[PDB]
Design an enzyme around this catalytic site. Structure first.
Site, PDB file in Angstrom:
ATOM      1  N   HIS A 122       0.858 -21.884 -17.762  1.00  0.00           N
ATOM      2  CA  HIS A 122       2.184 -21.973 -17.075  1.00  0.00           C
ATOM      3  C   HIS A 122       2.225 -23.131 -16.101  1.00  0.00           C
ATOM      4  CE1 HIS A 122       1.685 -17.500 -17.766  1.00  0.00           C
ATOM      5  NE2 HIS A 122       2.691 -17.854 -18.539  1.00  0.00           N
TER       6      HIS A 122
ATOM      7  N   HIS B  34      -0.170 -25.165  -6.830  1.00  0.00           N
ATOM      8  CA  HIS B  34       0.231 -25.577  -8.127  1.00  0.00           C
ATOM      9  C   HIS B  34       1.521 -26.298  -8.044  1.00  0.00           C
ATOM     10  CE1 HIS B  34       2.350 -21.794  -7.385  1.00  0.00           C
ATOM     11  NE2 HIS B  34       3.324 -22.430  -7.992  1.00  0.00           N
TER      12      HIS B  34
ATOM     13  N   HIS C 220       5.411 -27.418 -10.234  1.00  0.00           N
ATOM     14  CA  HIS C 220       6.371 -27.274 -11.278  1.00  0.00           C
ATOM     15  C   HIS C 220       6.970 -28.656 -11.539  1.00  0.00           C
ATOM     16  CE1 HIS C 220       6.416 -22.888 -10.619  1.00  0.00           C
ATOM     17  NE2 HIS C 220       6.184 -23.254  -9.400  1.00  0.00           N
TER      18      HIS C 220
ATOM     19  N   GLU D  51      12.066 -26.541  -8.371  1.00  0.00           N
ATOM     20  CA  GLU D  51      12.614 -25.179  -8.399  1.00  0.00           C
ATOM     21  C   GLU D  51      13.728 -25.048  -7.361  1.00  0.00           C
ATOM     22  OE1 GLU D  51       9.195 -22.415  -8.588  1.00  0.00           O
ATOM     23  OE2 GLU D  51       9.719 -22.469 -10.761  1.00  0.00           O
TER      24      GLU D  51
ATOM     25  N   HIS E  86       3.710 -26.072  -4.619  1.00  0.00           N
ATOM     26  CA  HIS E  86       3.669 -24.818  -3.950  1.00  0.00           C
ATOM     27  C   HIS E  86       2.275 -24.526  -3.474  1.00  0.00           C
ATOM     28  CE1 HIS E  86       7.419 -23.377  -6.284  1.00  0.00           C
ATOM     29  NE2 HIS E  86       7.701 -24.139  -5.219  1.00  0.00           N
TER      30      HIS E  86
ATOM     31  N   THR F 126       8.164 -17.199  -7.932  1.00  0.00           N
ATOM     32  CA  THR F 126       9.072 -17.804  -8.903  1.00  0.00           C
ATOM     33  C   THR F 126       8.598 -17.668 -10.323  1.00  0.00           C
ATOM     34  OG1 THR F 126       8.214 -20.046  -8.825  1.00  0.00           O
ATOM     35  CG2 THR F 126       9.946 -19.448  -7.210  1.00  0.00           C
ATOM     36  N   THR F 127       7.448 -17.008 -10.535  1.00  0.00           N
ATOM     37  CA  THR F 127       6.986 -16.631 -11.856  1.00  0.00           C
ATOM     38  C   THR F 127       6.819 -15.131 -11.841  1.00  0.00           C
ATOM     39  OG1 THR F 127       4.729 -17.054 -11.094  1.00  0.00           O
ATOM     40  CG2 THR F 127       5.804 -18.712 -12.401  1.00  0.00           C
TER      41      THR F 127
HETATM   42  O1  LIG Z   1       0.220 -15.898 -11.549  1.00  0.00           O
HETATM   43  C1  LIG Z   1       1.484 -15.820 -11.302  1.00  0.00           C
HETATM   44  O2  LIG Z   1       2.300 -16.519 -11.921  1.00  0.00           O
HETATM   45  C2  LIG Z   1       2.056 -14.953 -10.200  1.00  0.00           C
HETATM   46  C3  LIG Z   1       1.986 -15.767  -8.965  1.00  0.00           C
HETATM   47  C4  LIG Z   1       0.816 -15.906  -8.208  1.00  0.00           C
HETATM   48  C5  LIG Z   1       0.731 -16.617  -7.106  1.00  0.00           C
HETATM   49  C6  LIG Z   1       1.804 -17.376  -6.647  1.00  0.00           C
HETATM   50  C7  LIG Z   1       3.001 -17.283  -7.314  1.00  0.00           C
HETATM   51  N1  LIG Z   1       4.188 -17.933  -6.860  1.00  0.00           N
HETATM   52  O3  LIG Z   1       5.300 -17.750  -7.334  1.00  0.00           O
HETATM   53  O4  LIG Z   1       4.071 -18.845  -5.946  1.00  0.00           O
HETATM   54  C8  LIG Z   1       3.062 -16.491  -8.485  1.00  0.00           C
HETATM   55 ZN   LIG Z   2       5.343 -22.206  -7.905  1.00  0.00          ZN
END
Ligand SMILES: O=C(O)Cc1cccc([N+](=O)[O-])c1
Ligand SMILES: [Zn+2]
EC number: 4.2.1.1
Length: 257
Positions: A61, A91, A93, A103, A116, A195-196
């Protein structure tokens, strides 16, 4: 399982995660004209001098830069927050093209990418317990625009070839996330969600106003990642962003005039 396609993307997530249609979902559009300056907000305190990165991961992802969060080593405090929040991972996006990827949006403007930095409230002891609480996480969001290269990002870009596909990881020690921060810590803040999936409504969002600049070459290397696993049909890891969700009964507050 969920993803970012036609058949499994954001518009489908509610079927497995009904909280997708909740009251405090993220991201949101930040309407700069209606976000009110709040003089009671503090400066943010970002203390990453002892951060200990361990590893980078393609989770299918995005990719996660992971930290040792077994002590108070890299913490976020102040700002809108009460208490102390420990860095666990960062991470990004990003888009298929420079015109989308973020986002959060700012007056409907989409940036090329969004970083993020995810932190959990130490009062809950671990991440898994924190995500069950409305004040469990603080996520620092930082927009990326394409222009000058970000020297501090290059270490991350150069490891990506080794984690091309879902489930690959690689040692990634000694990376300093201070190199990803903009000059100003002016921010907007509001209550929201992951957001996931599972989209849990556990986040105090802190979105910096000032984007960082990365080069086209750097973002192009993000776009060479794969959503698929080794040896499966190649589907480039691009457009791994959730669009803005309804603000509902929320106020976005600005730390600055
Ligand atoms: O693994 C995952 O997608 C869930 C998750 C885990 C940690 C942070 C997140 N976020 O939206 O910033 C989401
Ligand atoms: Zn994120």
């Amino acid at each position: 399982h969920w993803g970012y396609g036609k058949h499994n993307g954001p518009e489908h997530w509610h079927k497995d995660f009904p909280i997708a249609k909740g009251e405090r979902q993220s991201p949101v559009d930040i309407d700069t004209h209606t976000a009110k300056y709040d003089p009671s907000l503090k400066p943010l305190s970002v203390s990453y001098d002892q951060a200990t990165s361990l590893r980078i991961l393609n989770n299918g992802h995005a990719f996660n830069v992971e930290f040792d969060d077994s002590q108070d080593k890299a913490v976020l405090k102040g700002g809108p927050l009460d208490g102390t929040y420990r860095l666990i991972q960062f991470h990004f996006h990003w888009g298929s093209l420079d015109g989308q990827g973020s986002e959060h949006t700012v007056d409907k403007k989409k940036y090329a990418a969004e970083l993020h930095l995810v932190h959990w409230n130490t009062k809950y002891g671990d991440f898994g317990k924190a995500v069950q609480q409305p004040d469990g996480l603080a996520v620092l969001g930082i927009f990326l625009k394409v222009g000058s290269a970000k020297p501090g990002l290059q270490k991350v870009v150069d490891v990506l070839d080794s984690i091309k596909t879902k489930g690959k990881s690689a040692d990634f020690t000694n990376f300093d996330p201070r190199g990803l921060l903009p000059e100003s810590l002016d921010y907007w803040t509001y209550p929201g969600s992951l957001t996931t999936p599972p989209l849990l409504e556990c986040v105090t969002w802190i979105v910096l106003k000032e984007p960082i600049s990365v080069s086209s070459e750097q973002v192009l290397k993000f776009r060479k990642l794969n959503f698929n696993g080794e040896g499966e049909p190649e589907e480039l890891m691009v457009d791994n962003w959730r669009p803005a969700q309804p603000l509902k009964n929320r106020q976005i507050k600005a730390s600055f005039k």
